[PDB]
Amino acid sequence: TTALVCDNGSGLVKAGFAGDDAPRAVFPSIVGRPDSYVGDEAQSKRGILTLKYPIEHGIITNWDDMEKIWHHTFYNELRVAPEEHPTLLTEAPLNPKANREKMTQIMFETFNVPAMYVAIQAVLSLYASGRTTGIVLDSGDGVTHNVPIYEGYALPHAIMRLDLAGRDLTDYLMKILTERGYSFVTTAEREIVRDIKEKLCYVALDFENEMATAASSSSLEKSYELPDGQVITIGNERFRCPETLFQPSFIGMESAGIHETTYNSIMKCDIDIRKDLYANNVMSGGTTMYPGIADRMQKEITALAPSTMKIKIIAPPERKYSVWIGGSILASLSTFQQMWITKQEYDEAGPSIVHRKC
Numbered sequence: 467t468t469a470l471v472c473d474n475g476s477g478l479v480k481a482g483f484a485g486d487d488a489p490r491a492v493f494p495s496i497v498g499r500p501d502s503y504v505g506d507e508a509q510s511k512r513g514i515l516t517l518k519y520p521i522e523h524g525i526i527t528n529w530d531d532m533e534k535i536w537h538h539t540f541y542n543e544l545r546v547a548p549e550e551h552p553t554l555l556t557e558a559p560l561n562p563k564a565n566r567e568k569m570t571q572i573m574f575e576t577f578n579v580p581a582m583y584v585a586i587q588a589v590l591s592l593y594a595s596g597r598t599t600g601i602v603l604d605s606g607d608g609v610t611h612n613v614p615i616y617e618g619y620a621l622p623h624a625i626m627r628l629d630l631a632g633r634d635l636t637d638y639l640m641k642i643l644t645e646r647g648y649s650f651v652t653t654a655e656r657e658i659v660r661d662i663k664e665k666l667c668y669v670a671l672d673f674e675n676e677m678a679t680a681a682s683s684s685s686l687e688k689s690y691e692l693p694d695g696q697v698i699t700i701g702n703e704r705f706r707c708p709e710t711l712f713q714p715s716f717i718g719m720e721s722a723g724i725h726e727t728t729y730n731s732i733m734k735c736d737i738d739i740r741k742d743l744y745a746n747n748v749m750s751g752g753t754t755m756y757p758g759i760a761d762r763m764q765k766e767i768t769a770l771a772p773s774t775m776k777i778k779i780i781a782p783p784e785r786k787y788s789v790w791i792g793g794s795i796l797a798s799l800s801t802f803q804q805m806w807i808t809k810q811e812y813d814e815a816g817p818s819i820v821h822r823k824c
């Protein structure tokens with residue numbers, strides 16, 4: 467009778483039970499072949515295996531391997547019979563109709579779920595923020611989106627997408643680190659540089675002032691001990707890596723930074739709701755965990771918004787898991803119980819039924 471919440475990301479799957487304050491399972495969204503290995507075990511044995519990510523930039527692209535992940539999730543991680551639980555899944559903003567249908571079809575036909583629903587990730591994070599109106603900046607491992615939401619529902623005409631998220635920030639850190647110049651090739655050293663990124667990187671409040679500080683002192687420098695025992699130092703790489711979110715030209719992207727996509731998203735919305743979007747800017751996803759990013763957004767958004775506008779950036783400490791938390795809350799609501807697509811409903815309509823109800 468308990469509902470399941472599965473939040474599938476490009477890099478990590480977050481899964482659990484509705485009503486819980488946290489997912490029971492969080493693991494890499496990967497499948498490895500030399501049988502098959504999924505998640506953590508596939509990560510452990512990366513030397514022997516060739517890995518594949520079934521979700522790219524938030525869109526499920528390898529359905530065969532996506533089935534392995536859902537299977538592993540239900541049977542190994544959550545240890546449930548999917549046919550006994552309503553299941554809530556998540557999807558990226560502007561997820562193709564065909565994609566939501568194929569998801570639906572698989573849940574009912576392969577997993578035989580009694581009921582299901584597919585919710586938009588960013589909407590779910592807003593709900594975890596205690597709100598139904600606001601604009602969410604969701605940045606994970608594969609994609610970044612700005613999603614303005616009004617009274618519970620996303621405004622799709624106004625959603626912005628930026629193909630630049632955590633994996634790109636890891637690659638850039640790897641690049642600039644090698645310019646320094648250390649050596650980080652393997653999938654091993656990839657985890658290593660992802661770890662450095664997550665423990666030592668931060669976002670400068672003023673980029674040019676921070677560089678000058680880095681150039682006139684070794685005070686911003688921090689050491690990092692590698693598995694083998696080697697020790698490395700990074701100074702300005704700490705803030706240059708995430709600066710890329712504000713300045714996509716750092717990795718050769720011709721795109722507005724996250725401060726501007728936020729602005730552009732608000733400007734595609736009705737004038738009368740902008741005040742509320744500016745006062746309710748919620749940060750979501752792992753790539754929004756950089757210290758100083760909330761303050762930098764506040765500064766950048768202030769510079770762009772009308773002079774008198776109240777700007778507020780909400781950056782919940784649990785934001786690596788906001789999407790999941792939002793689904794856990796939504797799926798447990800009495801008011802949502804009629805929104806589930808039931809197997810009888812599917813049995814009559816077909817996968818297309820997902821557009822009507824989700």
Ligand SMILES: Nc1ncnc2c1ncn2[C@@H]1O[C@H](COP(=O)(O)OP(=O)(O)OP(=O)(O)O)[C@@H](O)[C@H]1O
Nearest residue numbers: 475476477478606607608609632664751752753755
């Ligand atoms: N403390 C941190 N500082 C910087 N980055 C972090 C931190 N913690 C996690 N990340 C990054 O967040 C990303 C994973 O976050 P999240 O789970 O939001 O992504 P996802 O849902 O798998 O991907 P997407 O939403 O793009 O489809 C990874 O790139 C990871 O390195």
Ligand SMILES: [Ca+2]
Nearest residue numbers: 474475587606
């Ligand atoms: Ca995500």
